[PDB]
C-alpha cells in the first residue's frame, strides 16, 4: 500500500470502472490497470499543493505629542460564560488591527514613541464556540525614529521544513521499485511577518495651526 495517497489494490480486490473511479478520484492518481487477464492495479498517487497569502495593511494615526492615540480596525471576539451563581463573564475583546501611540517629539523631527502595534484576529474555535485560540501578533515597545524615517519595529521569518517518508523496507530497498514503495511527503510552509513605522510630525502643521 501507498501512503501519501494510500493505495493497496488487494484490500479492495476483496471488495474496476466504479471502484477505481471513486478510489482514484483524489487530485493526483496515476492508474495502471489490468482487468482482462487479471485485475492488477498499480497507481502512483501524488499531490503538490502551493498556497501563498500576503497581506499588507498600513494604518495612519494623528496623535498629540506625548499623548496616546489609537487606530483600531477590527471586531470584538467575546467569550460568554454565563455562570448563574454570580459570575456573568460577558467578556469581549476586539481582534482589531491597531496602533496605540504615545509620541515624544525631539527637535530634529524625531520621536521616541511608546507604540502598541497589534494585529489580532477572530478564532475558529471561538466562532466554533469551543475553546478559542484567537490569533495575536503584537509588539509593544518604545522606540526612537526621526519623523522622516521608517524603521522595522520588528518582524519574523518562519521557515518550515517537514519530511515524512513511509516505506516497506524490502520493496523500498529495490532501486526500481522503492520509489514505487517509498511514500515521501515534504512540506515547506514559510510565512514572514514584518512591521514598519514612520511618524510624520503634524506639528509642522500643528505649529502653523
Amino acid at each position: 500500500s501507498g501512503y501519501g495517497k494510500d493505495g493497496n489494490i488487494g484490500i479492495k480486490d476483496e471488495d474496476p470502472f466504479v471502484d477505481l473511479g471513486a478510489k482514484d478520484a483524489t487530485s493526483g492518481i496515476g492508474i495502471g490497470f489490468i482487468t482482462d487477464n487479471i485485475i492488477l492495479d498499480l497507481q502512483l498517487s501524488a499531490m503538490e499543493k502551493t498556497g501563498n497569502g500576503e497581506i499588507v495593511s498600513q494604518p495612519k494615526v494623528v496623535t498629540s505629542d506625548k499623548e496616546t492615540a489609537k487606530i483600531l480596525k477590527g471586531s470584538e471576539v467575546p467569550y460568554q460564560e454565563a455562570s448563574s451563581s454570580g459570575a456573568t463573564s460577558t467578556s469581549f475583546k476586539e481582534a482589531a488591527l491597531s496602533l496605540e501611540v504615545t509620541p515624544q517629539i525631539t527637535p530634529d523631527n524625531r520621536i521616541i514613541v511608546e507604540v502598541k502595534v497589534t494585529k489580532d484576529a477572530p478564532d475558529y474555535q471561538n466562532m466554533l464556540n469551543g475553546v478559542p485560540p484567537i490569533n495575536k501578533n503584537e509588539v509593544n515597545a518604545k522606540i526612537l525614529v526621526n519623523d522622516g524615517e521608517t524603521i522595522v519595529i520588528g518582524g519574523v521569518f518562519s521557515n518550515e521544513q517537514s519530511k515524512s517518508v513511509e516505506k516497506v523496507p524490502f520493496l523500498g530497498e529495490l532501486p526500481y521499485l522503492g520509489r514505487l514503495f517509498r511514500r515521501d511527503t515534504v512540506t515547506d510552509r514559510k510565512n514572514e511577518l514584518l512591521v514598519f513605522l514612520t511618524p510624520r510630525i503634524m506639528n509642522n502643521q500643528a505649529i502653523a495651526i
Binding site: 522606540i143 526612537l144 522595522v152
Partner: protein, 89 residues
C-alpha cells in the same frame, strides 16, 4: 530645552549641585528647565544637562530558533501459518 534629557534627571543634577553648596522652573511641554540661580551652579547643571540630553537607545534583537528532527522507525512481523498440520507462528 531638553527633548532627550528627562526633566527629573536635570532636577537631580541641580539637587546634587545644591549638595555641593536657587530658583527652578520646569516646563513639561517643551521639557525645558529655566533656572535662576548662581552662575556656577547653573553652568554645572547645564553641562550635566548636555550629558542627559541623550536619545533613548534602541537595539534590534534577532534570536533564531532552529529545530531539526530526523526519524527512523522499523517494525517487522514475521509470520508462518499453516493450518493443515496445525503449525502457525
Amino acid at each position: 530645552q531638553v527633548n532627550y534629557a528627562k526633566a527629573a534627571d536635570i532636577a537631580k543634577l541641580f539637587q546634587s549641585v545644591t549638595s555641593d553648596g536657587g530658583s527652578i522652573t520646569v516646563d513639561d511641554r517643551t521639557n525645558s528647565i529655566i533656572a535662576y540661580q548662581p552662575q556656577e551652579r547653573l553652568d554645572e547643571l547645564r553641562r550635566i544637562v548636555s550629558q542627559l540630553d541623550i536619545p533613548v537607545r534602541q537595539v534590534m534583537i534577532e534570536a533564531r530558533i532552529v529545530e531539526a528532527n530526523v526519524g527512523y522507525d522499523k517494525s517487522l512481523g514475521v509470520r508462518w501459518g499453516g493450518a493443515y498440520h496445525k503449525g502457525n507462528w
